[PDB]
Amino acid sequence: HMAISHVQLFSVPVSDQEKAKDFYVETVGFDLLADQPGVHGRWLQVAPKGADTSLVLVDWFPTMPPGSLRGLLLRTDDVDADCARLQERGVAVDGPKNTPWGRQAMFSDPDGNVIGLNQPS
Amino acid sequence: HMAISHVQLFSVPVSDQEKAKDFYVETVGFDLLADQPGVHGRWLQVAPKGADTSLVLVDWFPTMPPGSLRGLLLRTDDVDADCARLQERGVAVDGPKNTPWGRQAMFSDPDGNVIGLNQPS
Numbered sequence: 414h415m416a417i418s419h420v421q422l423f424s425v426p427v428s429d430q431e432k433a434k435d436f437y438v439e440t441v442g443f444d445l446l447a448d449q450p451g452v453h454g455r456w457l458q459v460a461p462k463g464a465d466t467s468l469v470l471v472d473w474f475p476t477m478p479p480g481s482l483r484g485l486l487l488r489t490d491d492v493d494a495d496c497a498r499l500q501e502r503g504v505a506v507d508g509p510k511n512t513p514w515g516r517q518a519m520f521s522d523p524d525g526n527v528i529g530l531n532q533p534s
Numbered sequence: 535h536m537a538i539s540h541v542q543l544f545s546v547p548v549s550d551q552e553k554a555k556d557f558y559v560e561t562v563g564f565d566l567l568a569d570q571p572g573v574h575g576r577w578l579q580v581a582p583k584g585a586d587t588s589l590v591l592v593d594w595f596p597t598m599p600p601g602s603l604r605g606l607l608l609r610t611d612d613v614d615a616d617c618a619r620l621q622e623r624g625v626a627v628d629g630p631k632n633t634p635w636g637r638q639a640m641f642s643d644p645d646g647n648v649i650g651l652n653q654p655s
């Protein structure tokens with residue numbers, strides 16, 4: 414019986430990392446956990462405050478070109494307010510629409526990776 | 535401040551969903567959270583028991599070809615016992631090795647997506 418407790422982190426492919434940083438931290442409001450050298454380049458690691466699973470903003474996997482990532486869904490406690498905030502902050506939002514699984518919206522980062530919001534029922 | 539609490543889920547590109555599911559559920563030991571019809575096909579969702587962030591094994595994003603995903607790291611309380619459990623079930627493992635950020639190991643799913651394991655020091 415495996416001792417795996419959770420996903421520590423996964424990777425999002427970006428091109429300009431400084432730009433991605435400011436987007437995920439200032440615009441989307443993630444916490445900046447680490448920004449330092451890593452083995453294949455600059456390790457840039459972000460997460461919603463207090464979450465167990467963080468995201469790494471990388472540029473070193475050929476198999477994941479910048480902006481390729483889809484099907485990422487972020488849980489929020491208030492999808493209307495978050496959409497209002499994003500729009501305020503100069504991001505294009507698609508939604509919020511209702512769905513069988515909660516109230517949802519979509520937007521994209523500066524490379525074109527597509528991020529969902531979901532507030533469950 | 536944004537009302538985003540955590541990443542609800544993210545996507546892992548696969549070809550055969552029935553193989554993938556058996557791999558993640560039987561080999562890697564995840565719980566099966568859903569196996570049901572979705573928008574763009576079959577919705578198949580796996581997570582470590584207890585965990586906030588879950589994984590969807592999808593086939594339908596052209597920008598994420600099967601087996602293309604990298605830089606996924608799973609947190610575990612016993613990487614040594616995990617690597618030996620994986621090995622006895624037919625999985626080629628690279629590790630464990632000590633790194634600055636914990637004891638770490640690596641393996642691929644049937645499609646070639648590279649999963650990491652990490653037990654912190």
Ligand SMILES: COC(=O)[C@H](O)[C@@](C)(O)[C@@]12O[C@]13c1cc(O)c4c(c1N[C@H]2C#C/C=C\C#C[C@H]3O)C(=O)c1c(ccc(O)c1O)C4=O
Pocket residue numbers: 423424447450451452453456469471604605606607635640648649650
């Ligand atoms: C082909 O797969 C790989 O290159 C690796 O085997 C990985 C993906 O698995 C990997 O070893 C990598 C790796 C590189 C890093 O620079 C770091 C890390 C690292 N672990 C694996 C993970 C990953 C996500 C993108 C990557 C890269 C590898 O270069 C870290 O884990 C790490 C780091 C910093 C603070 C942490 O708390 C931490 O956990 C960190 O800088």
Ligand SMILES: COC(=O)[C@H](O)[C@@](C)(O)[C@@]12O[C@]13c1cc(O)c4c(c1N[C@H]2C#C/C=C\C#C[C@H]3O)C(=O)c1c(ccc(O)c1O)C4=O
Pocket residue numbers: 483484485486514517518519528529531544545568571572573574577590592
């Ligand atoms: C069509 O919209 C999109 O392209 C977007 O990618 C999302 C983010 O909006 C996406 O709409 C998708 C989507 C399809 C689904 O079939 C589901 C869902 C779904 N939401 C978004 C999510 C995603 C990850 C891969 C996908 C694709 C879209 O088809 C769900 O969110 C969902 C589902 C089942 C139980 C849940 O608790 C749940 O949250 C579920 O079946």
